[PDB]
Amino acid sequence: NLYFQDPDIFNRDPRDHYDLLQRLGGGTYGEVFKARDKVSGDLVALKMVKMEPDDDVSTLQKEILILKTCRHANIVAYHGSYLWLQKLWICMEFCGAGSLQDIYQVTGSLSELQISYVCREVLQGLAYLHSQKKIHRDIKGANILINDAGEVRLADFGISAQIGATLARRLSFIGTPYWMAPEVAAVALKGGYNELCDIWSLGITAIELAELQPPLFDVHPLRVLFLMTKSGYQPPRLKEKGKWSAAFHNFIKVTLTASPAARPSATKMLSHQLVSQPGLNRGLILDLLDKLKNP
Amino acid sequence: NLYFQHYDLLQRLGGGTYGEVFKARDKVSGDLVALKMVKMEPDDDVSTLQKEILILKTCRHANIVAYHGSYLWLQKLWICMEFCGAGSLQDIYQVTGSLSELQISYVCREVLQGLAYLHSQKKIHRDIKGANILINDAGEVRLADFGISAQIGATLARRLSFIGTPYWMAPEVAAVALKGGYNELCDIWSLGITAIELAELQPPLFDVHPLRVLFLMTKSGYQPPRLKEKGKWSAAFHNFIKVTLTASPAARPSATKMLSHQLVSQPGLNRGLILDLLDKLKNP
Ligand SMILES: Cn1cc(Nc2ncc(C3=CCC[C@@H](NC(=O)c4ccccc4)C3)nc2C(N)=O)cn1
Numbered sequence: 001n002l003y004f005q006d007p008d009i010f011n012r013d014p015r016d017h018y019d020l021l022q023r024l025g026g027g028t029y030g031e032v033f034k035a036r037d038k039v040s041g042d043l044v045a046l047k048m049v050k051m052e053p054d055d056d057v058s059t060l061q062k063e064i065l066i067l068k069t070c071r072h073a074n075i076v077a078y079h080g081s082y083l084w085l086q087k088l089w090i091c092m093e094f095c096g097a098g099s100l101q102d103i104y105q106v107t108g109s110l111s112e113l114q115i116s117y118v119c120r121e122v123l124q125g126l127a128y129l130h131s132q133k134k135i136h137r138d139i140k141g142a143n144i145l146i147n148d149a150g151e152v153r154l155a156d157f158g159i160s161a162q163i164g165a166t167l168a169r170r171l172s173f174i175g176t177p178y179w180m181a182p183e184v185a186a187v188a189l190k191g192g193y194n195e196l197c198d199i200w201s202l203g204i205t206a207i208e209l210a211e212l213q214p215p216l217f218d219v220h221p222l223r224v225l226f227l228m229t230k231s232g233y234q235p236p237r238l239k240e241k242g243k244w245s246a247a248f249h250n251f252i253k254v255t256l257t258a259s260p261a262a263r264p265s266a267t268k269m270l271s272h273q274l275v276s277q278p279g280l281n282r283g284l285i286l287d288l289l290d291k292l293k294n295p
Numbered sequence: 296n297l298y299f300q301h302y303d304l305l306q307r308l309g310g311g312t313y314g315e316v317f318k319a320r321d322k323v324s325g326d327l328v329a330l331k332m333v334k335m336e337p338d339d340d341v342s343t344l345q346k347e348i349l350i351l352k353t354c355r356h357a358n359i360v361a362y363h364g365s366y367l368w369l370q371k372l373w374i375c376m377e378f379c380g381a382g383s384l385q386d387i388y389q390v391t392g393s394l395s396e397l398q399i400s401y402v403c404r405e406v407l408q409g410l411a412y413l414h415s416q417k418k419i420h421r422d423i424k425g426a427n428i429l430i431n432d433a434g435e436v437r438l439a440d441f442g443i444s445a446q447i448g449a450t451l452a453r454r455l456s457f458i459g460t461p462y463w464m465a466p467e468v469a470a471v472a473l474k475g476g477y478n479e480l481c482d483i484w485s486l487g488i489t490a491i492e493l494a495e496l497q498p499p500l501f502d503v504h505p506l507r508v509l510f511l512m513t514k515s516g517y518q519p520p521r522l523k524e525k526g527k528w529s530a531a532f533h534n535f536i537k538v539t540l541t542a543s544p545a546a547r548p549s550a551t552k553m554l555s556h557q558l559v560s561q562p563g564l565n566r567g568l569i570l571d572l573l574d575k576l577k578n579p
Pocket residue numbers: 024025029032045047067075076077078090092093094095096097098099102145155156157161
């Protein structure tokens with residue numbers, strides 16, 4: 001729909017249009033490289049995903065169309081895709097400072113104002129994704145990128161941006177779909193039903209930026225999961241008291257509401273004093289980036 | 296609410312991430328039982344054990360593997376249950392070949408009785424398929440369990456294995472109690488697919504990549520599957536498949552309404568049909 005706001009995939013080596021520079025990272029999502037446009041000199045990031053020989057082109061085109069229509073200032077901008085020698089290459093906006101986890105592992109804990117600006121920017125991205133009937137499902141410091149201008153970008157839009165190995169692992173969790181009714185298959189493909197899980201993850205991420213680890217990081221993962229099934233379950237909180245304002249403690253209290261029925265939406269969270277206060281701008285993050293270079 | 300409604304290990308029957316199931320014999324009478332050996336969670340307490348045992352004791356029906364009792368021994372929870380000697384319908388049809396229309400009609404009636412019971416208790420099974428329908432030596436049909444709500448421990452371990460660490464996950468994504476996006480009618484669809492599976496040895500689209508199937512089923516004009524060999528089946532069986540596989544859940548019939556369908560309400564549907572199927576195993 002052109003009323004809401006050119007080829008889908010090039011059958012060509014992206015090295016025909018870009019000079020591959022340094023490897024930025026890697027993992028289950030594939031490998032990401034910094035690159036430079038041969039004509040304009042503009043910098044981009046290129047993600048290389050290994051494809052299976054039997055991956056069908058019909059499904060790949062449907063997946064790429066989702067990347068093409070899901071766009072917001074607070075999500076890494078998608079530019080295009082290349083399919084060459086069994087590798088899918090996704091071209092996108094370059095975020096020079098890497099993830100918030102890459103940064104805080106050097107700088108230490110963020111200030112309350114720096115966290116407030118990050119939360120506001122992530123909530124703007126989530127309000128957009130939730131309006132499009134998508135669920136991110138992987139909000140955390142390692143998945144929030146920062147560019148050299150101090151701007152915040154979600155690394156991708158989560159569930160519906162998965163391709164390659166990450167998507168293969170999610171398909172294993174879903175299991176065989178041949179007996180699912182269409183409405184069950186819809187929830188499985190979307191990655192869930194309740195988008196308010198993202199609001200909880202943002203609350204945990206605010207603690208992660210304040211404390212350098214999410215709550216209970218040291219507890220065996222299967223125990224953390226089992227404790228969430230118990231009737232006595234209590235959500236986590238900030239470890240320190242006086243270091244943080246009453247507005248920050250309240251933001252954590254309301255985002256970390258165990259019952260999704262009582263948890264606020266992304267748009268309602270954007271009205272919370274913590275993220276609606278004046279003085280939240282990229283200058284706060286330029287100060288964090290300067291700390292990174294001159295410690 | 297009461298107003299509503301030792302052992303010798305013989306051989307391993309089943310196993311998975313949940314634990315193991317063994318065939319067992321009572322030393323006193325020689326009665327055969329199935330014993331499921333479960334590792335309890337490190338944070339399992341008196342109240343969590345009590346709620347799971349209460350659900351096992353109270354969620355009861357003839358067409359669901361019967362709970363007999365449980366005990367703690369060798370640091371494991373042992374659940375004693377009804378023994379179903381012939382295994383699952385999948386274990387059987389992989390040897391015998393496809394079931395006859397009458398055999399499928401009896402299996403569908405028996406599963407629908409189990410589902411009408413679960414749905415009356417506000418439970419959604421969400422795991423109906425040939426591999427999860429067990430048959431005893433008398434030809435009787437039993438759902439292996441009451442569904443995904445009897446598999447919480449295994450789902451948590453599967454989530455850790457394929458999704459990752461849980462530190463940023465909301466508690467509702469793990470507690471998985473009142474799931475949204477669908478209701479009990481998803482079980483009626485799965486039973487329709489199971490009827491095709493018993494007729495054809497595979498569900499429809501069994502050879503299509505899972506991601507492609509998810510995109511196909513979620514497309515607006517999705518056409519529900521049908522039995523592929525038209526002349527082999529009656530018009531009642533074709534209609535049973537058509538109504539169970541209603542794409543819109545708002546229009547899909549309930550388990551109790553399905554029990555009134557000519558296919559499963561016809562006379563002559565009894566466990567002898569399944570004893571005939573088990574006779575094919577002795578001399579294949
Ligand atoms: C250490 N370092 C890392 C970086 N910079 C990046 N590091 C990692 C990544 C990503 C990793 C995994 C997801 C990927 N996103 C997508 O594939 C995608 C985006 C939009 C729509 C659909 C899909 C982004 N991107 C950068 C960067 N864009 O600059 C600088 N320094």
